[model samples]
Target: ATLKVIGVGGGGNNAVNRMIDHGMNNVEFIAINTDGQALNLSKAESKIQIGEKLTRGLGAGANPEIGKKAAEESREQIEDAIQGADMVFVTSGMGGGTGTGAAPVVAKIAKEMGALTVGVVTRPFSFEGRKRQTQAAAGVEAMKAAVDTLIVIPNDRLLDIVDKSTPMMEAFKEADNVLRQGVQGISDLIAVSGEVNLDFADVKTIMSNQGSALMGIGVSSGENRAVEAAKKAISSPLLETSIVGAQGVLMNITGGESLSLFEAQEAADIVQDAADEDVNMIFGTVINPELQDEIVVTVIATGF
Candidate 1:
């Protein structure tokens, strides 16, 4: 099935287009720049103007308020764009304006519509300043409160990757690469079966059998025990469907290396286990290496 998505914020065409080029699409990249700078670079199906001259400081600036206004005025429009999105990945360069401002508003819309929303943001380094840092923190908190999941990338974190002593822009390339890959990993997980040879839908059995069950989520770079992580969930047996509420799921991972075939299998198993009984679906992300060889796993279970 084709998933409908709306990528709001950001105006750079190259950056936005690169996302589409990755093979995870069916998106409408809304460029926030007044002139629609993202329009020329976007290869998405639609491009619309949500606002302009919206950013002032670092991150969302005054546009956060403006974004709230846009959401209020175009309540129906925003809702329609995200109603059935399997996942809403909100992104912003964190420099201020629409990306910072409007993203959380859209996230609120997604949450209201029952869609899973995750925010991926970049934070300013220590030298960025108290005001920029304040804005970043505020933006982060707002998104955290509104969305289901949030991931923050600090500009300073990329220091070592770059010259460390060089300018922020010089380091942005490496940092931006990290951000792009993280979002792409989530996209890849959802679109796995179609692009590669894999079966999706983690939470299963919702329409079938009985049992109160739990499912575990796990991840690995290219190491061992990937099977063990999922085995825990699979062997746990489907929880009684008559538990009368939902299900409890646990997702864990072992080893640290990089994304290997084992990681994909682990992901697939997580979905299958979660769906053991009365599973509507599974929602998760895959960002394999944080520092070099650091693996992260996250899991959520609804009890029945």
Candidate 2:
């Protein structure tokens, strides 16, 4: 498939233009801004697809249910734009109306069209105050449910990257730049320009276990390395990450060849490496067909 990158910057703020300005040549940036705003301020091309652009530039207008509705209205159009592509990279600067609300709707469409959905989400900086922070947290949960995997880059984390004393506007620009780099990293991975071994359906199945799961994909460039990566990826969240009602681990790695039980043991070992001392977790698997040159493993962290 061709590369179809779609970004939804929810407000009329300059942040929306950040996407278009940095987007790849093939990417289509959609600025779902205020008062039916669509890249009006941007020199880059933009589309005015949002129905009701009601809200201030910084407020969260589109809630989860509204997100669901937006998905129904625009899924067909968005999906059509990325046809026959190798993968789809969907991103949103978390908070406000369009990014928080519509990014998920758009991601769900990409997944439905049988494309790999990778979401790059920017959570608000802690000092942005509680409103944007809360919206950012909620946005992560909503978008997580809609996409196969998410690369979460919290604003607080970005702050530590740059000069902590930088002004708010400059800090925001710096953070946005880093977020773009994260997107570029994945973009580079997607453009490995060779036989990709990971299967999208396998990843999709793992993502389908819940509305949104904070997931990580570990690829080793080979089966054992992939399994190792999977183990490392799943354990990080489990150590300090809490799934309120999480019960068990749904382990799945798909590749061309059958993975040895011994290799599976190594994968489990990698997970145990990060296991909390007091944590108790059940384990399951879908590893009959072992990982070949590439392996895609999924862990469904659940809660009732």
Candidate 3:
């Protein structure tokens, strides 16, 4: 199974850099951007500078129109980067250029290549401006058409999670972590398997054509390990919303060999209770050798 993760624009480039530095398994990181300065710093295995001539290796400078033009002109190279993958996960902030303009284009190409495209994108904080919010909504609409499942996290939701005294940088960290978890969760779902291995098609079945999905991860090690972990995932801090209406739920419960059958059932059962009745559930388990005695639950509730 092949997995490719692409980060577009400065926002995206930084995220890939962070995600890569932290080391997620079975992923080829590709950083695509119009800005050479940003691209050069990325630790992505591959970097593509779209619109090199248009921006002269500089940034699109907040103009998504230019971002789209650059991406269209460099469509071939972009396709080359994304071409052959079982799954493609794209992440970017949807407020400005590159990410806002070029992400949909990348997803469209990924879709045409027959890869399942999942987008974990973020909208800007309202304080950024009304114009940026409007721009982000437009990007979301375009991305919705391009990708099978698009997980849009509004930055304004940070208000619900972060303390009032937290610095601005902390908010970005929390937001970026959301995208990281989305990519890591899916990667773990297919690559890490247990008694009943998960099929790649199982992922596609729940992910394909699912729009505006929700993603959350929870880890716990106390006496009530499974229950606490599932609870945390269902109410992941980054999301102030609920998965009550979602039609499908894709979840991975990871732990050490000490992770028992009862715990696995207990964990996912909690998530099922949170979701609506008749929700299609795709559940998988993994034994991470590194874990001592902890239960990690990653949930992606789709078709919301």
* Best TM-score among the predictions, by candidate number: 3
Mind giving the per-residue lDDT tens digits that candidate 2 earns over 178-200?
A: 33543443343334332332233
Question: TM-score per candidate, in order?
Answer: 0.55, 0.54, 0.91
Tens-digit lDDT track of model 1 for 1-304: 2234445555233345555665554444533332254444567555545543342222233445765555455556666655556555555545455555666677677767765555556666678677767776777777767766554566666655556477755555444443354444334444533222222244221211222222223333344445544443343221111212344443333223454665646655554454555544333434334335645443434444
lDDT of 3 at 202: 83
lDDT digits (tens) for residues 106-192 of candidate 3: 888899999999887888988999999998888888899999988777888888877889997777777877777777666666665
**In order, what lDDT does every prediction score?**
0.48, 0.53, 0.83
lDDT for model 2, please.
0.53
Model 1 lDDT on a 0 to 1 scale: 0.48
The lDDT ranking, best first, is 3, 2, 1
lDDT over C-alpha atoms for residue 187 of model 2: 43
Query: Where in model 3 is the C-alpha error above 4 Å?
Result: 256-263, 287-292
Model 2, position 153: C-alpha lDDT score: 59
Arranged by TM-score, best first: 3, 1, 2
TM-score of 1: 0.55
The clash number for model 3 is 0
TM-score of 2: 0.54
